[PDB]
Each structure stands twice: as structure tokens, then as C-alpha cells.
């Protein structure tokens, strides 16, 4: 049984959404070429529908970052007088300093994540959401957990002070309320370090955003490689379009002119079907981001490394440019303590079992303890309950249960 | 000359010997922001990724980060989102004609935060 | 896929019958394979589109399953999982091409500000609120839980000992009423 | 993925080396990059799946 704790916050790094491309695709095959449109629509529909494949994601991108984040009816303010039990929330708090009124933390992931231009009939939409937004939601739901708990995740916000909020999250952990009330002062100081560390973390541990940056680095290569197709020269004399026209008689330029837009044609159709592919895992990871926002922002989960390594007490959100970070904030128990322990103890005849506890032993004397914390106390009628006789339970052992009332006669 | 990828981009003037850019002429796409057509026939127009000097109105004309926006009427206000258009702007039909906005993200609220008080 | 069937894929025709009618085999064989290239390949794009599509729908049975097993066959505690508010039941409808979930949740009104402490201060021990949270209504302090409001009475039966009073921050003193007492005189 | 490979695409031979030797260049040409575009697809097909 643990005698001392660690208070730590680790850092998930989710993906939300994709660059909104779209593409011209007559413009791609056949640019300002009369000729080679008039072949191109021998192909039906096929633009159309590579139209409204990429349109349909585009849309996608925009319904993600709304499922993860916009999980408040209400935005949040936080209070003009930052007194939070002695917890620095500094560094996670948007700074008003700043025209973009981003926390500390979120301009560290902006700044380390990465994001020539030249248009053939491709093109980039702009997200619906702006960052300045986005980090207004994330704001909401931070100065929301941070003043009512999880209340304002069921119904109306119910101001709480932190102090107290935090004791019901130790409760929630199967930790009693005199572990932090008496030791606030350690509690918070490990916290406000925990979060400083944060700042070296994203600082080193280079790149560290990988899952981010990654997923631009895929978008842009992806777009680069179908502009390098253009070149390519599928079987016909030239790559260039306008070669062919200049040089050739119009039914000898339609056959060569018909290899270029079947190669094209393969090119961009390859592009939509992964782009489809890598939306659906973007797709994938923002239901993980949105699922883990609900559960762990706005409530304390019990699913075990959903939210961190260790007991999971809080977490608080940060914005990022194409996807989100969550800060978890965990309980971790320390320094151990070998204890000889009972199942049950005989005391007249009947068997006594630990009430929200464990039996152990201090090498001379029992007590009954919690679990994940070592607090010890003596063992009465109050901490335990009585089952049947003492003949039934395998590694009974023997002991007196103390003073129920006999003091007070 | 070359870019990073294909098309010469410059091209020497073989009488003047002088060295031209070419710019591929501007465009992009057109696209229809309309209420249902079983409620009114007034639609607006966008010009995405262009600027408000291109597209050869008035009065009607806005210049969002998503194009140029014409038809549609700006205000000062801001309202749930309906019709999305891009970069926290989207529009709306009132009655008598489509409104562009930037969207709110919801009513504001305080917490009463206190050390020592609880709802 | 069935409108594709007209495009004439840089053959003569798009009608098969019109080609193998006309032409006879060595001019035709030529303009049906163009229509067979192009034919194929819209095939081939139907079947991977419905592959995409068919994984969502995969993804959205699985949850469905997920949340019937867990939000109809038992009460969730995840949060948002079951609709908003506190999950108490749900209840199942069939539809045409999938389900719906009719969740009942517990959403709490009307509230009201009281003055609170973390512990009472009783004759030099740290009092502290048993599955509840220690309210004031500005002239006396009750216990209540924290989902909904009822002041009780302040005993020892509601209460917990840890030490002295010297370490908690916003202990405020009180009288916790020992319930032996009117058992004794 | 291998099957596909002793097909004819529209093509004489599903073998290059019986393209090569039937037809000269200019022919060959033709007939190769039939065969190209026939297992290219293929390829395609199994990545994609
Ligand atoms: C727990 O460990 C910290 C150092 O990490 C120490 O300052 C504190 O006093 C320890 N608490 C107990 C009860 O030993
Ligand atoms: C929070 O930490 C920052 C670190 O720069 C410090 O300046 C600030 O005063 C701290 N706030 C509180 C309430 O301790
Ligand atoms: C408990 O006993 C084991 C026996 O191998 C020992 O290794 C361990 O260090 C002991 N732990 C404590 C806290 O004494
Ligand atoms: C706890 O163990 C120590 C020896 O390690 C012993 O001296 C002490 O008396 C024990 N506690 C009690 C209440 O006896
Ligand atoms: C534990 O194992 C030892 C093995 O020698 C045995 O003697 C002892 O009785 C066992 N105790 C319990 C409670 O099972
Ligand atoms: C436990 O108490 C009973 C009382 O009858 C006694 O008979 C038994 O021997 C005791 N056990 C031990 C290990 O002393
Ligand atoms: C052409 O030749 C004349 C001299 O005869 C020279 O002055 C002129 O600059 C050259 N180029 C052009 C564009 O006229
Ligand atoms: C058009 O709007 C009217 C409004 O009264 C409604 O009754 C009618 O059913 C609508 N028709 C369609 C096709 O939506
Ligand atoms: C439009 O062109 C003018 C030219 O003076 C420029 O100042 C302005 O920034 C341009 N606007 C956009 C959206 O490109
Ligand atoms: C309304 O928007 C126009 C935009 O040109 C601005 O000039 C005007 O001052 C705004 N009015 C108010 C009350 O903000
Ligand atoms: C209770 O909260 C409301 C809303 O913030 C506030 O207006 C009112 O003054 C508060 N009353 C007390 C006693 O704190
Ligand atoms: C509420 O406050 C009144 C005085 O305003 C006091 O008499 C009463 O005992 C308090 N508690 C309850 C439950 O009414
Ligand atoms: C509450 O804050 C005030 C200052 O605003 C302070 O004097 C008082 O001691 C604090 N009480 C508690 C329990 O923190
Ligand atoms: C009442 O509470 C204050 C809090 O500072 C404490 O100092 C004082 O001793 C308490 N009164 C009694 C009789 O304990």
C-alpha cells in the first residue's frame, strides 16, 4: 500500500480534420483546351462525380471539428480573480495580450506544426470554424471544468470551488477527501510543476507533434504528386496539351490527346479514392477526440488509460492546427509500503469484514486502511461489518474490535 | 524558365531578347448560396479564392477570406449559423433578402466563482 | 453506374447492338473494347465507392450495437454517450435502415446559491461531509448531497474524523449533533 | 494479384518476350503498353483493396 502520491499531466496529441481541397477537373485535364473538352465529355459524368466526392469530405472536415469541439450551449467566461486553491491555471488560460487570445501552451503547438502554390485547376477551401473560434470553444469548456466541475456538461453551470472540486474527483478515484484537503498545498504544487514541464516537453522531445504534422505532410504530398502527374506524358508525343494541338491535325491530335486525359483521368481518380481513405481515419480519430472530450473534459472517466496512465482525476483541452490536445491529469501512487494483511478478523466468535477498506498489519497491531493510500485507522464496529462465524474464511486471523461505545457507560 | 514543378512560367521575347512572367489568368470556383426555392427566389453568388476588383454590383458586395461575395447584404450581427460559407462567415435568409454574418458560437455566460460558494 | 451506360467512351456508339449490327469483327472489336475499358472502370469505381461507404456504415452498426448494449441493457456512466444530462435509461425503435435510441436523462433545475466549506471545526477535530457537501443557508449549516437539495441535519452518522483543525483552509466552526445524546439522558 | 499477370488485356500475349519477338518495335509498342495499363490496374486494384 502506496504512503505518498504523484500528481502528473500527460499530453495526447488527436487529429481532427483535413485540408478542404477541391479540384477543377476539366480544368486539371484539359485546362483552356476547347478540343480536349469536348473529348473529355465522352467520359460522362465522371467529373461530377469526383466533384462531389471531394465536396462531400470537404463538408466532413467542418462536421469534425464541430463534433469535437462546440460541446457547450454557452461560452464560458473565467472570473477576474484567479483564486483556484492555490492551482496555475496561467498557462492553459487564453492571454488577453495576444490578438489571436490563445493560452501560452496552444502558441507553442501552433508555432512547432508546419503548414509552391501554383493553381492548375486545384484549389484549397478555407475551414468554417476560424482558430480565433476554435480557441473560443476550447476556452468555454476550460473555464467551464475549471468553475463547475461537470455540471455544466449535464444541464446549467453550478459554481464550485476548485479546492472542493478536486475533492470530489479524489473521491471518484476511491481516495478519500482527507488525502486532499490535507495536503492541498503538495497537491497544487505538484500540479503547477506538472504543467510547467508541459512547456519543455512540446519545447524538446523534438517535433513532438508528429501525428499533426503528419497529416499536413501527407495532405501536401498528396497534392504534389498529382500536379507532378501532369508532366508525366502518358504514351502520347508531348505533356504539354497546347504541343500537341500546335503540331498535329485535329484527328491526330485526338488520339494522342485521348492518352493524356486517360492518364489524368487515373491520376485524379487515384487522389479522391485516398483522399476518401484518409478521411474516414480522420473521421475515425475525431469520434476518438470528440468521445474523449465528452468523457474526459466534462466528466471524470473510470475506463482505464482512456485518459491517461494513472487514476484519472481531470483533463483540460488545447487547440492545435488540425486537430487537439488533451492535458490529462492523473493520480499516481508512490513510495510502497510491504504491510501484512487478513482477509477477516475473529473476534467473538463472528467474523469481522473491512467496511470501504483493507485489513493490515503494523507487525503488532491491525488496522483497516483505504486502498491507494496508506492512512491507517483502528478497527472498530464503525470501519467493519460481521458475517457468520469464524470457521468459514480462509486466512482468518485473530484480533479485538475496539470500543463500539463500552468508553461511554 | 521553370517552376517548382512544370510549365516554363517566363519566356524570353525573341526580338527584344527581355524576360516575361506568365501568370495563368485568374479564376476559380462559382458557387450558388440559396434559401430553398419553395421559399424565395433571390439567391447570392461566390467567387471563391478571388478579390472584390475581379469578376467584371455595389452595395451588395463583401469581401470575405473565402472569395468575393455578391448579393448577399452584411450586418454588424451575428446569429446561429445556417447557410456556411467560410472562415467563421455563413448566410441567412430574413424577411427581405440574404444576410452575411459572422457566426456566433453561442450566448455568453459568467460562472459565479467563488472560494466559498456553491450551487 | 447506370447512366454511364449511354457515354460513348471514344467509340463509334454507345449502343453495343448499334456497334456489333454495323461494324463487322475487325472494326468492331475495336470500338466495343473502348466500351469495355470505360464501362469497367465505372464499375470498378461503384464498388470501391461502396467499399468506403459500407465501412461507415460498418463503424456506425458497431456503435449502435455498442450503445444498445450499454445504453438499453444497462445504465452508462460515460458521459454525452447516452444524450445529454445523467443517463438513466433508453429505449429502442426500429427504422428503416438503421435504429433509434430514445435516451432518458436526469437533468438538474432551479438552483440555488449556498455558502460551503470543505469541513466543520468541532471541539478541535476536522469534520468532514460523508457522501454529501456541507451547505449554509446564511444562518445554519446543513448537509446535503450534491445532485439535488435537502438540508439535513449535521451528526455524527454523516460525518468523518480525519485529525486537528490546523491543516484545512476553509474550516469553518460548528456543533456536529451526536444522536446518542437525548438515547442517553 | 499473380493471375492477372497470364492475361491478355486485348493484347496478343500476355508474355513480353512473345510480343517482342512476334512484332517489331512500332508493334510491340502498342501491345506492351496494353499489357502496362492492364496490370497497373490490377495493382491499383490490390493496393486499393
Ligand atoms: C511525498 O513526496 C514529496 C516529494 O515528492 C514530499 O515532499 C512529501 O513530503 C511526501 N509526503 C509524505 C507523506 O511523505
Ligand atoms: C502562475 O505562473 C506564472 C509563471 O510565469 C507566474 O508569473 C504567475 O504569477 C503564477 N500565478 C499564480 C497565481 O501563482
Ligand atoms: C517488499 O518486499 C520485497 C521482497 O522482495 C522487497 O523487494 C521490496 O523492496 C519490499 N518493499 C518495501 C517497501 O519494503
Ligand atoms: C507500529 O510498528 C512499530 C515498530 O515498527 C511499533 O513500535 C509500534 O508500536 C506499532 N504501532 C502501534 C500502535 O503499536
Ligand atoms: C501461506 O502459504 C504458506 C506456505 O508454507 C502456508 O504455510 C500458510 O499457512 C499460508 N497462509 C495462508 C493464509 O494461506
Ligand atoms: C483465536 O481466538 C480463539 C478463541 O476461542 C482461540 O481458540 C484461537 O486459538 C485463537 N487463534 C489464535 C491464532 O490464537
Ligand atoms: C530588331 O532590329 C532593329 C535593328 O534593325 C533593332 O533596333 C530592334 O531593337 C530589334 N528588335 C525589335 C523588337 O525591333
Ligand atoms: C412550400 O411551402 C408551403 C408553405 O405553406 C408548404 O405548405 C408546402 O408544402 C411547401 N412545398 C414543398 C415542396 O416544400
Ligand atoms: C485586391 O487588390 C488590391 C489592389 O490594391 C489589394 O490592395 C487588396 O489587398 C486585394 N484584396 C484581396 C482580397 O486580394
Ligand atoms: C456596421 O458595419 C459597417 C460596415 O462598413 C460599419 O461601417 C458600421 O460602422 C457598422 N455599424 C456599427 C454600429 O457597428
Ligand atoms: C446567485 O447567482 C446569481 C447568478 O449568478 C446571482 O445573480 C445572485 O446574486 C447569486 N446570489 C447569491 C446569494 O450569491
Ligand atoms: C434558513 O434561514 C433561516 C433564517 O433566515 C433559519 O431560521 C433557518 O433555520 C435556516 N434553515 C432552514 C432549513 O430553514
Ligand atoms: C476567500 O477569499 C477571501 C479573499 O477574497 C479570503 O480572505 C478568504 O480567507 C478566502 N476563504 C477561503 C475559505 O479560501
Ligand atoms: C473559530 O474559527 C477560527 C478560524 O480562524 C479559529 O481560529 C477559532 O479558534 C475558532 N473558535 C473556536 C472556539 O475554536
Request: glycine share 6%.
Given at each position: ?41 465522352q467520359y460522362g459524368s465522371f467529373c461530377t462525380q469526383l466533384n462531389r466526392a471531394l465536396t462531400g469530405i470537404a463538408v466532413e472536415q467542418d462536421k469534425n471539428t464541430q463534433e469535437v469541439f462546440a460541446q457547450v450551449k454557452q461560452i464560458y467566461k473565467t472570473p477576474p480573480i484567479k483564486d483556484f486553491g492555490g492551482f496555475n491555471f496561467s498557462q492553459i488560460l487564453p492571454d488577453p495580450s495576444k490578438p489571436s487570445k490563445r493560452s501560452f501552451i496552444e502558441d507553442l503547438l501552433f508555432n512547432k506544426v508546419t503548414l509552391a502554390q501554383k493553381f492548375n485547376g486545384l484549389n484549397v477551401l478555407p475551414p468554417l470554424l476560424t482558430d480565433e473560434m476554435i480557441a473560443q470553444y476550447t476556452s468555454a469548456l476550460l473555464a467551464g471544468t475549471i468553475t463547475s466541475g461537470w455540471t455544466f456538461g449535464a444541464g446549467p453551470a453550478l459554481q464550485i470551488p476548485f479546492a472542493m472540486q478536486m475533492a470530489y474527483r479524489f473521491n471518484g478515484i476511491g481516495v478519500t477527501q482527507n488525502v486532499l484537503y490535507e495536503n492541498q498545498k503538495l497537491i497544487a504544487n505538484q500540479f503547477n510543476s506538472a504543467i510547467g514541464k508541459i512547456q519543455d516537453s512540446l519545447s524538446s522531445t523534438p517535433s513532438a507533434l508528429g501525428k499533426l504534422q503528419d497529416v499536413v505532410n501527407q495532405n501536401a504530398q498528396a497534392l504534389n504528386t498529382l500536379v507532378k502527374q501532369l508532366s508525366s506524358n502518358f504514351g502520347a508525343i508531348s505533356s504539354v496539351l497546347n ?167 | ?119 | ?185
Amino acid at each position: 500500500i502506496p504512503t505518498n502520491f504523484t500528481i502528473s499531466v500527460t499530453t495526447e496529441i488527436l487529429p481532427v480534420s483535413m485540408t478542404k481541397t477541391s479540384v477543377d477537373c476539366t480544368m486539371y485535364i484539359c485546362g483552356d483546351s476547347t478540343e480536349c473538352s469536348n473529348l473529355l465529355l465522352q467520359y460522362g459524368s465522371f467529373c461530377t462525380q469526383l466533384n462531389r466526392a471531394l465536396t462531400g469530405i470537404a463538408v466532413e472536415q467542418d462536421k469534425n471539428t464541430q463534433e469535437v469541439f462546440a460541446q457547450v450551449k454557452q461560452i464560458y467566461k473565467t472570473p477576474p480573480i484567479k483564486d483556484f486553491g492555490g492551482f496555475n491555471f496561467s498557462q492553459i488560460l487564453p492571454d488577453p495580450s495576444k490578438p489571436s487570445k490563445r493560452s501560452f501552451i496552444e502558441d507553442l503547438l501552433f508555432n512547432k506544426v508546419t503548414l509552391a502554390q501554383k493553381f492548375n485547376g486545384l484549389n484549397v477551401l478555407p475551414p468554417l470554424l476560424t482558430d480565433e473560434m476554435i480557441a473560443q470553444y476550447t476556452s468555454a469548456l476550460l473555464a467551464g471544468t475549471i468553475t463547475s466541475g461537470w455540471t455544466f456538461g449535464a444541464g446549467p453551470a453550478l459554481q464550485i470551488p476548485f479546492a472542493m472540486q478536486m475533492a470530489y474527483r479524489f473521491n471518484g478515484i476511491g481516495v478519500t477527501q482527507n488525502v486532499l484537503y490535507e495536503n492541498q498545498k503538495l497537491i497544487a504544487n505538484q500540479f503547477n510543476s506538472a504543467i510547467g514541464k508541459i512547456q519543455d516537453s512540446l519545447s524538446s522531445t523534438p517535433s513532438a507533434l508528429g501525428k499533426l504534422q503528419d497529416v499536413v505532410n501527407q495532405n501536401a504530398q498528396a497534392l504534389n504528386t498529382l500536379v507532378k502527374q501532369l508532366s508525366s506524358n502518358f504514351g502520347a508525343i508531348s505533356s504539354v496539351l497546347n504541343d500537341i494541338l500546335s503540331r498535329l491535325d485535329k484527328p491526330e491530335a485526338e488520339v494522342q490527346i485521348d492518352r493524356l486525359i486517360t492518364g489524368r483521368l487515373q491520376s485524379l481518380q487515384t487522389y479522391v479514392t485516398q483522399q476518401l481513405i484518409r478521411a474516414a481515419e480522420i473521421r475515425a480519430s475525431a469520434n476518438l477526440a470528440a468521445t474523449k472530450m465528452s468523457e474526459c473534459v466534462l466528466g471524470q472517466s473510470k475506463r482505464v488509460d482512456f485518459c491517461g496512465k494513472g487514476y484519472h482525476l481531470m483533463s483540460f483541452p488545447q487547440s492545435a492546427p488540425h486537430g487537439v490536445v488533451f492535458l490529462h491529469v492523473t493520480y499516481v501512487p508512490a513510495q510502497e509500503k510491504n504491510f501484512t494483511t487478513a482477509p477477516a478478523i475473529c473476534h467473538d466468535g463472528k467474523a469481522h469484514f473491512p467496511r470501504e477498506g483493507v485489513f493490515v498489519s503494523n507487525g503488532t497491531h491491525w488496522f483497516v486502511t483505504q486502498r491507494n493510500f496508506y492512512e491507517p485507522q483502528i478497527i472498530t464496529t464503525d470501519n467493519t461489518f460481521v458475517s457468520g462465524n469464524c470457521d468459514v474464511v480462509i486466512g482468518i486471523v485473530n484480533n479485538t474490535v475496539y470500543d463500539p461505545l463500552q468508553p461511554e457507560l | 524558365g521553370r517552376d517548382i514543378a512544370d510549365t516554363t512560367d517566363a519566356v524570353r521575347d525573341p526580338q527584344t531578347l527581355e524576360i516575361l512572367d506568365i501568370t495563368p489568368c485568374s479564376f476559380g470556383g462559382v458557387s450558388v448560396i440559396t434559401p430553398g426555392t419553395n421559399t424565395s427566389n433571390q439567391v447570392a453568388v461566390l467567387y471563391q479564392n478571388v478579390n472584390c476588383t475581379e469578376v467584371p454590383t455595389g452595395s451588395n458586395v463583401f469581401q470575405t477570406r473565402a472569395g468575393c461575395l455578391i448579393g448577399a447584404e452584411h450586418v454588424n450581427n451575428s446569429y446561429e449559423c445556417d447557410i456556411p460559407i467560410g472562415a467563421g462567415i455563413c448566410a441567412s435568409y430574413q424577411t427581405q433578402s440574404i444576410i452575411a454574418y459572422t457566426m456566433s458560437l453561442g450566448a455568453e455566460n459568467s460562472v459565479a466563482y467563488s472560494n466559498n460558494s456553491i450551487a | 453506374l447506370v447512366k454511364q451506360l449511354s457515354s460513348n467512351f471514344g467509340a463509334i456508339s454507345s449502343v453495343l447492338n448499334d456497334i456489333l449490327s454495323r461494324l463487322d469483327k475487325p472494326e468492331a472489336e475495336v470500338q466495343i473494347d473502348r466500351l469495355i475499358t470505360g464501362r469497367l472502370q465505372s464499375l470498378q469505381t461503384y464498388v470501391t465507392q461502396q467499399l468506403i461507404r459500407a465501412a461507415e456504415i460498418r463503424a456506425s452498426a458497431n456503435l449502435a450495437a455498442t450503445k444498445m448494449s450499454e445504453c438499453v441493457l444497462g445504465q452508462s456512466k460515460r458521459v454525452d454517450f447516452c444524450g445529454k444530462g445523467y443517463h438513466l435509461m433508453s429505449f429502442p425503435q426500429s427504422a428503416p435502415h438503421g435504429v433509434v435510441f430514445l435516451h432518458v436523462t436526469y437533468v438538474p433545475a432551479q438552483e440555488k446559491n449556498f455558502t460551503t466549506a470543505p469541513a466543520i471545526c468541532h471541539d478541535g477535530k476536522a469534520h468532514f461531509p460523508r457522501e454529501g457537501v456541507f451547505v449554509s443557508n446564511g444562518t445554519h449549516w446543513f448537509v446535503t448531497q450534491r445532485n439535488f437539495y435537502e438540508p439535513q441535519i449535521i451528526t455524527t452518522d454523516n460525518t468523518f474524523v480525519s485529525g486537528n483543525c490546523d491543516v484545512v483552509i476553509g474550516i469553518v466552526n460548528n456543533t456536529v449533533y451526536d444522536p446518542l445524546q437525548p438515547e442517553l439522558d
